[PDB]
Amino acid sequence: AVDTAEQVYISSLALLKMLKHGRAGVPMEVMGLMLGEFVDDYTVRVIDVFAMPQSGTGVSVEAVDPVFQAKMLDMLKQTGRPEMVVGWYHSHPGFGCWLSGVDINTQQSFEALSERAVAVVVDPIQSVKGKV
Amino acid sequence: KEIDGRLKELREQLKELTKQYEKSENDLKALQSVGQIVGEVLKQLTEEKFIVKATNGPRYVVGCRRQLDKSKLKPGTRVALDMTTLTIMRYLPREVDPLVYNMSHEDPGNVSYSEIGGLSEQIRELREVIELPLTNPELFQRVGIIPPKGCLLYGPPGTGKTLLARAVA
Amino acid sequence: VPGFLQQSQNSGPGQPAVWHRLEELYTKKLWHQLTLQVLDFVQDPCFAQGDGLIKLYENFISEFEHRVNPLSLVEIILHVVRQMTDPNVALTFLEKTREKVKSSDEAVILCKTAIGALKLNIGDLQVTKETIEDVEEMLNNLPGVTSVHSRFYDLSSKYYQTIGNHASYYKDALRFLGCVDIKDLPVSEQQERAFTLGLAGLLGEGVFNFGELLMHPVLESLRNTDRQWLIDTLYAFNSGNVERFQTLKTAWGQQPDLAANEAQLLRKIQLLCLMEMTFTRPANHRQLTFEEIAKSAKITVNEVELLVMKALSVGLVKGSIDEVDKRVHMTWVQPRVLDLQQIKGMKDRLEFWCTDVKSMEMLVEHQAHDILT
Amino acid sequence: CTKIINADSEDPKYIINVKQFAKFVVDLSDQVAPTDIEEGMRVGVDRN
Amino acid sequence: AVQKVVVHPLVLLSVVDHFNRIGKVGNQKRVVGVLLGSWQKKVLDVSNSFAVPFDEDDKDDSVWFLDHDYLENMYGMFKKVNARERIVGWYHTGPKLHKNDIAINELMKRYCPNSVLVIIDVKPKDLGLPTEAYISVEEVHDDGTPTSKTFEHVTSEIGAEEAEEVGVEHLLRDIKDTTVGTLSQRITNQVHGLKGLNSKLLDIRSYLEKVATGKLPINHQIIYQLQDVFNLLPDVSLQEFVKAFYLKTNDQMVVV
Amino acid sequence: MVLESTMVCVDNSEYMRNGDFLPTRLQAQQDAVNIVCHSKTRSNPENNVGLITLANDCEVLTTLTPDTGRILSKLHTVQPKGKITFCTGIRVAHLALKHRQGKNHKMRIIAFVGSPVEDNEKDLVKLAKRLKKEKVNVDIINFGEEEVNTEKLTAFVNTLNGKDGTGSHLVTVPPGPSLADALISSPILAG
Amino acid sequence: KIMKSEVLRVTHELQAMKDKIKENSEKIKVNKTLPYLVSNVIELLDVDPGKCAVIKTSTRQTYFLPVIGLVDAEKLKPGDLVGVNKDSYLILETLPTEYDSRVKAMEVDERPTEQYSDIGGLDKQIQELVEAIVLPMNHKEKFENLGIQPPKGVLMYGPPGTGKTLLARACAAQTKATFLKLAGPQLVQMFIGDG
Ligand SMILES: Nc1ncnc2c1ncn2[C@@H]1O[C@H](COP(=O)(O)OP(=O)(O)O)[C@@H](O)[C@H]1O
Ligand SMILES: Nc1ncnc2c1ncn2[C@@H]1O[C@H](COP(=O)(O)OP(=O)(O)O)[C@@H](O)[C@H]1O
């Protein structure tokens, strides 16, 4: 129940994956999980992020396939560098910095799973020239 | 032969079949496919600025980014837009009246126009209004006239008008 | 098979030792090592006089083992096929080898080369043009096998004495020289090969550069002891040297295939004597006056028009041609060997450009200390 | 928003005309059995 | 077979980070993976990268290992999330290329027919080159030369990925690498342009000098075919300035 | 339970397609691969067996996996036309099996040799010393005609099983026919 | 020979092939379970430099899904009321159209139950039209094999109260097929083209 002035060390390649995934799945509100680790309470660092195809159901927890996520994590461990899951990202063309009702529900499930599971709103359409 | 003939069964069942993984990907490709909004370019604002009317909503302006061949785009052309990508990603020709298209391209298998008798004068009227203008424009060029436009048929409800229309179709 | 082995142990001194090896190899079912033994016996210092008998024995052994190495067997039995020396049945022999080994390996394409070689020896009209073209048409997805490529290069080099290919025949002969590096054959025959290639360049028309043979040590050292006047003439064609006396001595030095085309030698050397001015002077002397042309080509005034015409056609000089002052503008788009021993000239010009660029960069920096400092 | 329903398939799917002019079909919510909903009856739809 | 390749500003930093993260325990200096992208109009582009731990031995350069099952699973996942992305080539660090590249290319070309090699200089930033592209051509070295490997460089240019301008501007936000300050910025444009021209042409002069000394093998058969025209092109004739004495000097004097 | 991770390097030399065994020696070695993989599967179906090649290449596609069909499919039509590179083959087998695997999984490399080899004695002794320093556990099984259990192979095995090692043996097979059950009888339960 | 390798691929390549459309279909059938935009097909036969489509959506939008990525235009003939993706903006699947308000159910009886026994008097005429209408329904294959296409237009004229309506419904019941009744005297509509 301690949340100070926390800061996220997001990586540039994580940004590039975000913009590429959003540019690919523009109107679909594509989903993903931000691969980060709580090195301490508030200095969270994210080095990598992945792109996952949103299922036809829409924004659902089962859309992020658990077996596929586990296999992806194992692939990262074997080749690359392992990294924990304490966050998520989502291209949000609908409206701005808030979460829809279903987004809140799936973030609540993520919060139950993880410790914080930060709710990150990235708007792929509003970011055009200077402000992402 | 058992190791020969049992093969010839199993691959044939597929061929046309087992053609699903890519159909699945294509419709998944559709699942994350961006749907690009469609308008008609009313006029070209500048060489890079083009005034386009959404078929329903307001006129926007968009701009080709690097290689969309802005020269071939014309006032009234069809292009695909996205409220996010800010540009035209590809261009698209026109339409063909689909409802009319199929009901005008579903002429049933008829018999020749020679299978109806007593209307040879009407047959040659159809020939010298349809075939003659396109086969021999040189004669009419020496004439120096435009070919006629249309012909009217009328009379008792039973004449063969539907047969003649279906035969020429 | 044991009976044939017993019969085959005779008909040669030292053969039964190899035949015992052959007996062991098929006892343990060896095919590749068997091909090496067959390779050793065929390349043994003997003429293989019993060509028909050994053909029957080899076909006997191969047909009852039916697992030998295909490409290497055909590489070896082809010696027996050529040695049998009867073209009417030799074509059937090559078809039989094709039927016995019809795989897409070196075997089939080698059989095609054998067909083409036979057509050269007799009947040079039946399938000669189709065969030679089809070899290259079938060397697809085969970048560096280099075995049958050398074969194809050899046939087409021997096809130089045919109307179809003269300049291309020289090109593939160079390809043979590159692909096979060691001598692997008498120096005198290579010197003869160098003589034929030299005559090919002299007689040819499109071979203006004709690189990899002008100053190539592999080709020149063959004739470094005999007919060095051929070495000098090719060097004249390379560096643009005229040596009209020596080149005329070249014309009647090797009378066959040179006497009729000595006029073509005149035109080519006049064509290629201007390149020495072209690269040495990077537009430093861009006024190619008639007197300068006369010094470079020792040609008359009326022939200058034809020479510069052919120069524009081939690609030596593409500049404007005047006649009030007779000035030829200098552009070259067909580079060739620049006598790498004389690379100091272009190195000096390049370092001159480096000094000029750096000096002007420093000068503008000196004029710009009021902004950049 | 609430709108009428048009028709349905054999059982699971429901082809519906909506006051948003919508050619609308949905899996009926788990709390609602297909028996209760009948053709030509107004049903509210959750925007999500 | 491709005409040219174009590298995005999208994978260069990803490869460098992959080098950094897997180099913690693997100090082989050799990082080998695959670059994924698309090839549409004789222009090849790279959109994704992946690194695999990779060890080497100097003995004939034939000692190595990879995780091909994991790498193949990555490709399936990448294609599933984005169908247009496909393996365009395989990359290796260590610009001093060794001999195992031919074996790696043979193994990975089952994913891409025109297998290409890419070298990323993680630590080196010599002048501005982030990476280099390599095409495998073993179809005879030349007309009259012996057999060789001869991995040539297909021309590579850094492309302009979309939607990354926002991120890069926010990232740097300190240098402003744009034409801002038109007069001063173009002066800097002239400065390093002369710096690049002087450095590269000096390298060409050094190569000509070293060819003259002959300590290194001479690839003259393409060197003089490409540099002779460069030298003889008549850009030194000043009589066209005489014909164009007012080339723009009229525009110079009106601007004054 | 003590689980075994085995990486097999199979001799795809130019001679392996000969018919010394009934189909071929290449198929006989393939039959040697799937029976030992079957035995690993019967011990525990999640035992993993992977393929390594040494015919101027190192096949890694068939990774350290329990499934055997990928080995059978990929090793089939291997085109046994190239040469043999013994020094590279076992070494790359070490690196490939050095990849991510359970620490409980016992590391073991098995080698199949069926053709005569022409390699330097000094180079292979240097490899044996290097593998001795690296504490490598490799057993080698021969097949068909060869200078079977040659001086290089005997010294290579002796270094890898000596100094109170596992005790893996190399069998001196008769040229041509061989009894694969007798070849793998000892290392399947002892070594 | 070469079977056991082929089919171990084939049966595996059969089942995995079909499973992914089973995945995909689901991934698009939930979208097909959530279509929201009517399909006012304004077609283009856009041959790729095959076809294409314009969909006037319910929310007054237009979506040019390329080459119609899911449904063949042979069955996707133009009209309205054919599934369109709410998110992918693609044609989803065909569905029944709208039967012109009045025609949806004007007086259509699903199945009449009146029997032929309760009518009579004109038995020669009723048997005549049964042979011309009912037999072309039950024994339609008899006419197909014979080669004579049965006539369709039967005009039953006579003063009211002669049992024409019962006979038509009784014949429809005997055919066990759909019966549609038209209120002829009220087809004269003031709206143009309404009738
Ligand atoms: N001149 C004719 N020759 C042959 N058949 C005819 C003729 N006139 C009418 N029919 C018959 O009438 C039917 C076609 O109707 P039609 O008279 O063409 O309608 P409309 O007169 O409204 O065009 C066909 O079954 C055909 O057999
Ligand atoms: N043959 C018949 N058998 C039984 N009822 C009949 C018969 N003929 C007429 N009807 C009666 O007539 C009514 C149908 O009237 P209507 O359809 O207006 O006559 P029509 O069909 O001659 O125009 C029915 O209610 C039916 O009870």
Side-chain angles (χ1 to χ4, degrees), chain G residues 118-121 158-166:
Chain G
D118 69 69
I119 49 93
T162 44
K164 314 178 181 62
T165 52
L166 295 174

Side-chain angles (χ1 to χ4, degrees), chain B residues 43-46 48-53 58-63 81 86-87:
Chain B
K43 77 167 299 306
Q44 310 174 0
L45 186 56
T46 78
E48 50 90 16
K49 284 160 102 202
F50 318 94
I51 289 148
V52 55
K53 173 68 172 69
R59 290 97 172 171
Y60 318 115
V61 183
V62 299
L81 323 171
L86 188 142
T87 65

Side-chain angles (χ1 to χ4, degrees), chain B residues 115-117 119 156-164 166:
Chain B
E115 305 302 321
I116 51 187
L119 282 72
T159 43
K161 286 179 280 289
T162 310
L163 313 168
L164 201 48
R166 193 165 67 248

